[PDB]
Design a binder for this molecule. Structure first.
Ligand code: COA
Ligand code: TPP
Ligand code: SF4
Ligand code: SF4
Ligand code: SF4
Ligand code: MG
Ligand code: MG
Lengths: 1169, 390, 194
């Protein structure tokens, strides 16, 4: 049948049919394969063996690879899905699996490796890093080929006993939706070598016919034993070739080990691999029809590399070859495929000039204009070798120049771009628009989707295509027949009409009248509309949504308008298909919600307005640029162009060679995405600063000011006398940053005043006012105050050093780190694990960690997902080493003829160099006396003082903080964390427990509680939550504390200060509410209070210092819960969806979860009593 | 002075002098390096910084690699010792360490990888499995060269900011005892680029001058940012070459990126790497004195592969080359060094017949009788390609 | 990986042969090495106390954990092995295995394990989750009161006497810490049993 799928589903489709067990671990962009395989098992899909696939989630990809090896050796056909860093962690087991000749298929969504920086996007770095494991390697270039070649790999591995890596380009193919021919399970079983399967069962480990495998060998036989497998690798190319003929007989589609396309007498040929082959073949057709003698060699079977099948498809007329590698091996003579082509051509005496290039790293664009630049370089007098395409390399001059733009798209292919907001449905609608066209026309359909790095409120760009000819355009839309803008705020921000075809359609959502368009639209936009003679349409999708009560959901309104103007299918038939997709997509929401979306379709047709514009719009003149601002060089050259969606224009010279970025750059974003912002009521405020504490973006803060500093204050900067003996005679005000606020509403919910001092007002009503208020409050001078930092009110008078991050509105993670920066940010270094905390904490080019007025702030670094504890442990070793070098220079300064005041501060520092307060006290005296002391010294004495001045940044004791999610702490990094905590180092580990893998979509973890439903746990998690805090207490010398900000403000303050002052390992497990729980984020703080009150989350503190005082180290801060446990679970979707999915098993799990919470509570009572 | 050492101690000798922290995890045959480094610290041996080396044992080699990355990023010169399966578990962190241009030296006692069976004995399977990480790779062929080239790697990594894997054949060199010239710590500190060390301290993570490293990047800038480190990799071969001249002035022993030995008018040349070069040079002397026109190219700097320095030492009379790889990549068109030689010779239009072979897997014997069998195959009417010896 | 497999609940039997060193590779330090013992990569002796693997696996509640020693009690080893295998779930057996890297006469290898339990150096316990389903206490302490001197047992093995020969001034400090840690571990097993 024909279905519109993505590469991942196409791979999972074949893999589910051919496998009995599948051990998985989530990683973008390969995790969707395991997600849909888990869902199919929950709904009972049968494979060719008549059973459901068993999905096992491990603690890492290393654990997954070991389980595959055991499952295969024990007699079960096993597969797995992974990519990038995950594939690397499987490489040690891959040597064993290939070495023992076990039939197996790894499906890889090829993704870049973390080098100078993390990139979740696609290239061949991961696959190339395992090319020496002995696995075969088969590449899919299109969604159709993912379907076909996955079946080829599963069929071939049974015959050859050589394991296969079937890999396709991450996102570019794994996430591209296409209408493809799906191969039925019944046909696959008709092609399976059943004799080979039964023989594989006979080799299984079984006590009734035992054997030994995986021995240890001496040098006498290891070499011979390694060569004994050679016949299997010699025979594999022929086996893959014959399997490819079986697929041809079934599908009619002919694949070969190496495929050729282009002129039969071509002289310039490109050799390439992956999705680029689609783009190159599209360009080759265009160039051959124009008379050029060019061709293309598609590499399907990369390993084993069959020299015979490569030369078999190389025309005898070929004189120059360019090999394209989607990877980079620094310092190497050439990239992997390039050295293979060069070798085989040398082995057969072909005198052909070969040149290699790099492309598409991290999903870099690779379009036909680039393919011609590669072909044209081959036509040059001296072709440049070791080149790059798609960047401007003005440093090393490896980039090819894209001289001209060509359009190689087949005639008759419709092209569409859609600009939408997050959570408005634009992307979901275009997914169903493709299903409408593909399921109901003879046309091929294709859709690729671009999301922002931000978690919510970010721009999304949808690229769709459909034509009578097959769609090989594996690149973004060059020239669009239609462009739609689903958010009017983008008007004036982004070049929406780039590449719009003349006489094309432009679709807009706004409340602007045909007359108001002259003022609200930019001149360059009005110029393009009139010059290219575009059909301009507009619909007030917002008003239609509010009249029916749909809210912000406008996709159905805009989708209906699309089929109305695009004339892809007659509008009468199109509307029927749109109503059907509402049930199939939004059915699970309600019966009333569907009739509200059905009425939206009808009112959308009637409210579509074609705008007749004056032809004089062609002569509209750009606005006068307001007085420019003097922003830093990095903000001007890097941050602004990237946010303006022009980052691809930046040359290589823009960037540092080691991925180092400045701090405090998110304050320059000013996104202004809030619908409502808090408005402060000065008469109702008790001056408690709780609103600044819970703000997930540091957008609301208290400000103190002497009465003289209120000179240039706006009329709306109303102040009140400051309460407290420390701030006597001062003014107080709670001020919000309107452009950085997210509108979550957490600050208003926590406000404990009798009358609410914070009320939610719409942003647009008070944005002009509150902007002037914040701009004045931000420029207030620092005010030294003696408020106790150990209290909530005192801590918020300290400047926050984590501001305006990319976390979700109301995130439960960022409030924790923000409080830490206000207490110890002056002198702390952060080792952050990969996860949400690394995505909102360190996504280029914006850094949310900032500095204070003295220029000091937290230094932030993220290495890998699995090593974060040992990463931070290494920092603690080095920082101690740097302080040791300084103490040596200080001790030598005592013996030198220096001032008596200088000697006094040095002796004071040496005694308290390991005390946070004392090292700052005597250190600052040393820093103050150094410049005058250096002026009064000479000779070697001056050199000794100059060496101390070089190291004065290590006088103040640092605070190492290791931050990560529960997925890192409970699973993949627990082994490393256990070792770091057991070592006794003076580090502070902060675990942000969201009980799911929040970054990757919300997958199951050992931190997930009983009965909760998450991805890879479709039927609910049976096993109870792993008690990380209890195991770390077994050492006795590790400080462990369980906190929850929403439950108790005072308990969080005490645990944070006690853990940091502890001269040893400290572990803080913080409850962080998350959107993957399925709750209203406005009450995120309230959800944490209900968690502790219902016995769902414990609050305790284990202090080893109390044991040294003869006291009990364990303190139970909450003994008797007062709320119902069952009522708290029903307040979150992650537990209610269990009743909707598996209703009969749901009631059993709720009883187990409540019994486990009482057994955990009574266990904490025994340790306390 | 002259002392009788093994390769491991010779490597540990230089590594202890040049490093402040060393995170380790035991694995044969590399664990003796960390064992003797731990003993020296207990007895208070001072490095060129006047302090004792801090040895930290982790829960795995993966934990060791992460600690090196953190210790380097925080401002301490760090090293480690590993091999075989241990080196594989460090490969994910090696991409970060090389990608962030941190000066570092991994000392590897090259050992076979566990495939159909475990083997604690020596070959280049481990080193070849990380040749795409961006680390430089420097090979020692004798106990004397372990001493000298370890110093070259530690000195070069400070100048180039490119991390080095200094590897020597497991057991065959790491456990071979030889009377060698030991280089004094005082001479090493006289060769250290102290300006480079202080600059490396300035890049450390510190709250009083903070920065962000290791960000997450979208497709718009990841490619450009990856190519921005190219000047460092282009300059590394020249830096290693000049560092090799410093060692020559101190020791009198001349190393090059690629070294040649044999007849000046040789027509059959072997390209090889590691301890086999000692055996091949011994055979070449024997064959040249008997009138045969044969030669040998020793590969010292395997990565970055400098095409210029390789062709610089290739006699113009060479007509046939046999490349020897102490590793096996099943199904591949050829083994790693073989494809490198074949590529550079193709890039410069040399019409030379090249053939590749495999040897010495899991410390398989490689003796001069085998070296002649390789040379005699080059003399055949049709030399066999993709062969094995031993 | 072991923590994940035991937490999964699979019907597997994990047998940990605890030699407190990396015996194959020459005798290097491990988290299983006790306080004060000298091994490779711990030239000055291990400061941190022994990691309690058995105690952490008991935190799950559904994992059978047992500490055995053949030289100490033949009958206790038989019961723990049969109970752990019949348990339809994860079972963890931590067995004390004397080794040459301890520095003792291997003729009395069995005798050294008996002295280990009798001096409070090695515990003998069994955690049965099936006892919890019967309303009973899952933890059984099979050896409550030690009868031998703790300091005398350490001096019977070279891995502790070489500390007095290498670092004599720090050696007496570590012996007091090792004996205090064994009593705190023993009283902690008494609280779970009482
Ligand atoms: C997908 C994403 C870009 C938002 O896209 P979009 O243009 O808003 O389109 P979507 O189809 O996702 O939005 C529909 C959502 O809004 C709601 N929706 C929109 N219109 C609706 C309507 N009329 N009726 C009912 N629900 C509607 C739904 O609740 C749905 O969310 P849910 O089904 O997950 O609860 C964003 O959520 C995202 O970035 N996701 C993760 C992307 C990723 O793959 N990341 C890799 C991990 S690092
Ligand atoms: C070795 C490796 N495996 C998997 C991944 C993919 N990955 C990134 S973040 C993440 C999980 C994050 O979950 P968590 O640790 O709980 O942090 P959170 O997002 O919830 O804050 C995963 C699996 C990776 N980057 N590296
Ligand atoms: S939470 Fe309310 S009472 Fe407290 S400082 Fe903020 S506005 Fe004032
Ligand atoms: S609404 Fe949310 S983001 Fe805005 S100020 Fe209040 S807490 Fe901060
Ligand atoms: S942890 Fe949850 S709420 Fe916070 S940013 Fe990640 S997905 Fe959003
Ligand atoms: Mg999480
Ligand atoms: Mg052991």
């Amino acid at each position: 049948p024909k279905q519109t799928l993505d590469g991942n589903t196409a791979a999972a489709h074949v893999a589910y049919a051919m496998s009995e067990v599948a051990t998985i671990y989530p990683i973008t962009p390969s995790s969707p394969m395991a997600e849909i395989a888990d869902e199919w098992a929950a709904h009972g899909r049968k494979n060719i063996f008549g059973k459901t696939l068993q999905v096992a989630e491990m603690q890492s990809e290393a654990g997954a690879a070991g389980a595959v090896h055991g499952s295969l050796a024990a007699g079960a056909l096993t597969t797995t899905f992974t990519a990038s860093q995950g594939l690397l962690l499987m490489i040690p087991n891959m040597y064993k699996i290939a070495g023992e000749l076990l039939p197996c298929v790894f499906h890889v969504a090829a993704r870049a490796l973390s080098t100078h920086a993390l990139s979740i996007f696609g290239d061949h770095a991961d696959v190339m890093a395992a090319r020496q494991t002995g696995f075969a390697m088969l590449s899919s270039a299109s969604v159709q080929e993912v379907m076909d070649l996955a079946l080829v790999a599963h069929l071939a591995t049974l015959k050859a006993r050589v394991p296969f890596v079937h890999f396709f380009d991450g996102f570019r193919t794994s996430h591209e939706v296409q209408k493809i021919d799906v191969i039925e399970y019944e046909d696959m079983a008709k092609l399976v070598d059943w004799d080979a399967i039964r023989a594989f069962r006979q080799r299984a480990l079984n006590p009734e016919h035992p054997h030994q495998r995986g021995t240890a060998q001496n040098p006498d036989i290891y070499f011979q034993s390694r060569e004994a497998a050679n016949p299997y690798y010699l025979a594999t190319p022929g086996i893959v070739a014959q399997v490819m003929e079986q697929v041809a007989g079934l599908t009619g589609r002919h694949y070969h080990l190496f495929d050729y396309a282009g002129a039969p007498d071509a002289e310039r040929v490109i050799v390439s691999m992956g999705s680029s082959c689609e783009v190159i073949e599209e360009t080759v057709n265009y160039l051959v029809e124009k008379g050029e003698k060019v061709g293309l060699i598609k590499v399907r079977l990369f390993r084993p590399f069959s020299a015979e099948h490569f030369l078999k498809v190389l025309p005898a007329s070929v004189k120059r070859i360019a090999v394209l590698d989607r990877t980079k091996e620094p310092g190497s003579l050439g990239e992997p495929l390039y050295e293979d082509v060069q070798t085989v051509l040398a082995e057969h005496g072909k005198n052909i000039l070969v040149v290699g290039g790099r492309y598409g790293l991290g999903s870099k664009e690779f379009n036909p204009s680039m393919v011609k630049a590669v072909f044209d370089n081959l036509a040059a007098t001296t072709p440049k070798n070791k080149f790059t395409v798609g960047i401007t390399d003005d440093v090393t001059h490896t980039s090819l120049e894209i001289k001209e733009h060509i359009d190689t798209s087949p005639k008759g292919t419709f092209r569409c771009k859609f600009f939408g907001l997050g959570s408005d449905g634009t992307v979901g609608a275009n997914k169903n628009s493709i299903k409408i066209i593909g399921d109901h026309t003879d046309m091929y359909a294709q859709g690729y989707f671009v999301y922002d790095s931000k978690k919510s409120g970010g721009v999304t760009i949808s690229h769709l295509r459909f034509g009578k000819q097959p769609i090989q355009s594996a690149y973004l839309i060059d020239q669009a027949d239609l462009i739609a803008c689903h958010n009017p705020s983008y008007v004036g921000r982004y070049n929406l009409l780039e590449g719009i075809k003349p006489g094309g359609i432009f679709l807009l959502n706004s409340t602007w009248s045909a007359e108001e368009m002259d003022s609200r639209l930019p001149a360059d936009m009005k110029r393009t509309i009139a010059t290219k003679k575009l059909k301009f349409y507009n619909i007030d999708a917002v008003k239609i949504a509010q009249e029916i009560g749909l809210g912000s959901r406008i996709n159905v309104i805009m989708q209906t308008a699309f089929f109305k103007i695009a004339n892809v299918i007659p509008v009468d038939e199109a509307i029927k298909y749109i109503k059907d997709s509402i049930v199939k997509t939004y059915g699970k929401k309600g019966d009333k919600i569907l009739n509200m979306n059905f009425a939206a379709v009808d009112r959308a047709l009637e409210a579509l307005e074609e705008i007749k514009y004056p032809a004089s719009w062609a002569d509209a003149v750009d606005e006068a640029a307001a007085t420019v601002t003097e922003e830093p060089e990095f903000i001007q050259k890097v941050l602004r162009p990237i946010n303006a969606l022009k980052g691809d224009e930046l040359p290589v010279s823009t960037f540092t060679p080691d991925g180092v970025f400045p701090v405090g750059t998110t304050k320059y974003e000013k996104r202004g995405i809030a619908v409502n912002i808090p408005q402060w009521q000065p008469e109702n405020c008790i001056q408690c600063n709780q609103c600044s504490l819970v703000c997930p973006h540091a957008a609301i803060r208290p400000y103190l000011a002497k009465p003289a500093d209120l000179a240039g204050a706006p009329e709306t900067f109303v102040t009140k006398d400051a309460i407290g003996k420390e701030a006597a005679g001062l003014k107080f005000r709670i001020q919000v940053s309107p452009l950085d606020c997210t509108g979550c509403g957490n600050c208003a919910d926590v406000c404990p005043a009798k009358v609410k001092a914070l009320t939610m007002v719409p942003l647009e009503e008070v944005t002009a006012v509150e902007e002037a208020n914040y701009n004045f409050a931000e420029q207030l001078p620092e005010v030294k105050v003696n408020f106790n930092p150990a209290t909530v009110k005192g801590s918020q008078f300290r400047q926050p050093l984590l501001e305006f991050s990319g976390a979700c509105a109301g995130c439960g993670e960022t409030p924790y780190v923000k409080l830490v920066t206000q207490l110890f940010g002056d002198r702390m270094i952060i080792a952050n694990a990969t996860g949400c905390s690394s995505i909102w904490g360190g996504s280029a080019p914006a850094c949310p960690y900032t500095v204070n007025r003295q220029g000091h702030g937290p230094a932030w670094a993220s290495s890998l997902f699995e090593d974060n504890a040992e990463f931070g442990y290494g920092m603690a070793l080095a920082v101690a080493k740097r302080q040791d070098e300084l103490a040596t220079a200080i001790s030598k300064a005592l013996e030198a003829p220096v001032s008596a005041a200088f000697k006094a501060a040095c002796e004071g520092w040496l005694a308290g160099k390991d005390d946070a307060d004392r090292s700052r006290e005597y250190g600052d005296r040393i820093k103050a006396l150094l410049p005058g002391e250096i002026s009064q010294a000479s000779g070697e004495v001056k050199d000794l003082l100059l060496d101390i001045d070089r190291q004065k940044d290590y006088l103040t004791k640092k605070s190492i903080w290791i931050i990560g999610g529960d997925g890192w702490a409970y699973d993949i990094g627990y082994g490393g964390l256990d070792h770091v905590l057991a070592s006794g180092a003076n580090v502070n580990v902060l675990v942000l427990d969201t009980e799911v893998y929040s970054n990757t979509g919300g997958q199951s973890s050992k931190a997930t509680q009983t009965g909760a439903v998450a991805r890879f746990a479709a039927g609910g998690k049976f096993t109870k939550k792993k008690d990380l805090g209890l195991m770390a207490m077994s050492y006795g010398y590790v400080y462990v504390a369980s906190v929850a900000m929403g439950a108790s403000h005072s308990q969080l303050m005490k645990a944070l200060i006690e853990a940091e002052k502890y001269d040893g390992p400290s572990l803080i497990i913080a409850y962080a509410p998350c959107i993957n729980h399925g709750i209203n984020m406005t009450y995120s703080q309230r959800e944490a209070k209900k968690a502790v009150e219902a016995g769902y989350w414990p609050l305790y503190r284990y202090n080893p210092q109390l044991a040294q005082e003869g006291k009990n180290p364990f303190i139970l801060d909450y003994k008797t819960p007062t709320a119902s446990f069952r009522d708290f679970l029903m307040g979150e979707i992650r537990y209610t969806s269990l009743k909707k999915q598996f209703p009969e098993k749901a009631e059993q799990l709720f009883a187990k979860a409540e019994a486990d919470a009482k057994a955990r509570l009574e266990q904490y009572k025994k340790l306390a009593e």
